[PDB]
Design a protein around this ligand. Sequence first.
Ligand SMILES: OC[C@H]1O[C@H](O[C@H]2[C@H](O)[C@@H](O)[C@@H](O)O[C@@H]2CO)[C@H](O)[C@@H](O)[C@@H]1O
Length: 603
Amino acid sequence: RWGSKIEEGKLVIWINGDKGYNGLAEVGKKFEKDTGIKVTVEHPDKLEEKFPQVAATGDGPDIIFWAHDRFGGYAQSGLLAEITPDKAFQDKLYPFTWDAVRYNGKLIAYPIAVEALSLIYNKDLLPNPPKTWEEIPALDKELKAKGKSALMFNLQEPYFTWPLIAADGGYAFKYENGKYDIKDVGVDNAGAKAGLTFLVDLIKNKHMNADTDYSIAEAAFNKGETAMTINGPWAWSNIDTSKVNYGVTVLPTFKGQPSKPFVGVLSAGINAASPNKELAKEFLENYLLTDEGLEAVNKDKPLGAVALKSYEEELGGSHNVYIMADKQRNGIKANFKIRHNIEDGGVQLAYHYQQNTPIGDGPVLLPDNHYLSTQSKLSKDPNEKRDHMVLLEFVTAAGITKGEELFTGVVPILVELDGDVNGHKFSVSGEGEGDATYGKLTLKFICTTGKLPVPWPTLVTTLVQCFSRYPDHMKQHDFFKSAMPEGYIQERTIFFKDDGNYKTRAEVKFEGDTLVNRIELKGIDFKEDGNILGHKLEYNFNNPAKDPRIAATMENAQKGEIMPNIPQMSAFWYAVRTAVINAASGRQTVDEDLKDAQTRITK
Ligand SMILES: OC[C@H]1O[C@H](O[C@H]2[C@H](O)[C@@H](O)[C@@H](O)O[C@@H]2CO)[C@H](O)[C@@H](O)[C@@H]1O
């Protein structure tokens, strides 16, 4: 019918009231300073409901911030402009974040950050938080005797109860090669019913109240009245302020399975009715999606795991082994940072650089960018009198969403290392076994020359990533197994912060039916009284993340499932909100409530 009501030569931004809007307004101010384009940030109530209404009239903000789930219904209605970042810009964000903001293939928002719920706990009330939902009733009873509760969280919004509902099988819409079946809905299967029954049981047994909402839970946790809550990264600042000694960790399991929170990509979309689309583009691309821009928002209220690689590298500290194809060497490179705990406190950084080149001239898989997530545990064999290390490691590939035949069983491993650190020569032999099906390494190492002159934990990375578990969907990214049996050369430099460096070269290959890692290490420039040569590192491989809260967010997100963005998501949310609220409050049984939700969603 008519023209836009939105004013030219300025930007009006809507963002939710739980996000860092004062921080974003600081980015606005800098933009205004540089360009003369005034930026107003607003945080209206129920803004995800008000946008489609005002935007259809040709009105509303120039930019709207929300999790990516609602943007497909906006895009279906013609309310969002197709965005046009070029290849160079797109390469600056994780690929998977761009996929969250596609509607019929087209990019319709800029991803900003990847959000998942975690378990937030009070370390003074609960130094070891529960691994299982099932143990929380007894924990509540114990805490109640001391006038505290175990757990309070927002039961009024379905986003917060969904991790429990989905844990044993509930799902929103079924995904089947390419799209969501709008008629195959998982809110009323056995798994959803069991989660929602567990929640209702908590309320019947008086471990939770039906009326707990976002404000009540946050105030209870921040005043030290409940030992746990469930919330997202945006809430961490208010906790910081309260001075409660908190941790953020993996959500509890239910019937043995991880909780499955929905994964939201906070995203910024451009109103189709804005006459300021180029200015909005410049703001989001050249001001907000920069390290300085995300930091201003992040310092206000934490974003989580940001979409922008450069700033996620600064926040996250390169926790995982990050792998890239090195086409020139028909191989790969990798970098990552290990953090070794120092005995009476502190952390000793070890910056790792890596490259692998196949030995044989035969074909190998060159992967897309991805990472390996590694967990290691160190122990001692009480019968072993030589200086030694017992290692158990688990490794899995992630980071996107024939030699392999030599690894389908359990392979014996042998390791030989000749070292020279500041002229101090030493040798290590190891043996054990790898089970690539489970990503599992079990090994024992001995210093064959007497006392190891460096801490054992500093040699863990040097002492067979062919034993990583690459899931089905990622097998084409496994360079390591594809090199075998002839194998590969692996080279590293490892720089120890404020101290020396290791340079390593290894051949990793089958000799007969044994996987053998033969290594030469040279250490130069170390301090004799430093952490390494002075043996000041704790004996473990805890390798804590720079920010354990971000690590816990990504752990929970990988166990979760990306929100669909289909227009039917608004009927989904309404239907589950109603079913959960009803069931909690004793209106109808869990079965009837979830059945009504199913019927409403699929109509
Ligand atoms: O509870 C339903 C609601 O869940 C999600 O909203 C989250 C949002 O993603 C987070 O950024 C944060 O603000 O908490 C909200 C829950 O209160 C969906 O994104 C949203 O569309 C849906 O209605």
